[model samples]
Target: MQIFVKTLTGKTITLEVEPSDTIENVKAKIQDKEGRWALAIPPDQQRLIFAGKQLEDGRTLSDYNIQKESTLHLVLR
Candidate 1:
């Protein structure tokens, strides 16, 4: 259950995410610009693949069923 982020690297770390959180928003926040934070990337040049589905910024994690275990894939596409 809950939410987790995986792929692009080598981990399936657990996390607490909001149902309202969007893929793009997560990307914008996770992707560090100027060597910012833990997760880093270029929003304009990056893509996120979660649960074998391409993530859409307009959608929420709840759409993918947060009540159960779900895999989010972060790919460099």
Candidate 2:
């Protein structure tokens, strides 16, 4: 399935994901999806927020109850 990941700059990228995909996995995938500058915004610097909670790197999407088509807010730290 896929989910919408939106950035502070208003860029939204749809990512291919699964219930077991961790936050780190999603960020790594974003680096490839968004291209070059994404290197500057590595997984450690990326914050994935869904439903008002900040997602942890080691946790799976299902841990946060994230579903297909959910909108995840990406804030760079």
Candidate 3:
């Protein structure tokens, strides 16, 4: 499935993901996507929020009821 990661600067990052993917896994994908001279933010410094809840490292997307096309807010911590 595809999910959207929105940044504070109004940039929307579209990523491919699986329902069983962990929050940590998603962070790794984000880090890989933006770490190479783009945003340069690492997984540990990235905070992902969806449906008004903060996503934890060990939790899966299914745990948060995330679906395709869902938008997650990304904030630098």
Candidate 4:
């Protein structure tokens, strides 16, 4: 599925990832482009709310009920 990834620096990147991809994998991809490992937020701090619930591990965008056009916000601290 395709998911939109956004960084704390206000940069947006669209990636086509599989449901099996973990949060850590996503963060690594973001770091690949951002060139700053510290920009990635931990899973505990994800704060990703969808369908009135918070997202956790082993949950894909589809599990969160997010659309293909859905956007993920990440804070680089």
Best by lDDT: 2
Counting only residues 3 or more apart in sequence or on different chains, how many pairs clash (N, Cα, C under 3 Å) in candidate 2?
0
lDDT of 4: 0.62
Q: Of models 1 and 3, which has the larger lDDT?
A: 3
Name the TM-score of candidate 4: 0.60
TM-score of each: 0.61, 0.88, 0.83, 0.60
Model 4: per-residue Cα lDDT over 13-48, one tens digit each = 887777666655665665666635545456455444
Predicted candidate 2 versus true structure: per-residue lDDT over 1-77, tens digit per residue: 89998875779999999899999899788777775666566567779889989899999998998999999998976
Candidate 2 TM-score, C-alpha based: 0.88
lDDT (10s digit) by residue, model 3, range 1-77: 99989865657888999999999999777766663455555567778999889899999999999999999998866
lDDT of 1 by residue, 1-77 (tens): 35556645655656555677776766654553223343445565566676567777778767755444565666666
* Candidate order by decreasing TM-score: 2, 3, 1, 4
Model 3 lDDT-worst window of ten? 33-42
Residue 59 Cα positional deviation in candidate 3, in Å, after optimal superposition = 0.3
TM-score pick, better of 2 and 3: 2
The lDDT, on a scale of 0 to 1, for candidate 1 is 0.59
Which lDDT values do the candidates have, in the order given?
A: 0.59, 0.85, 0.84, 0.62
| Per-model RMSD to reference | 3.9, 1.4, 2.0, 3.5
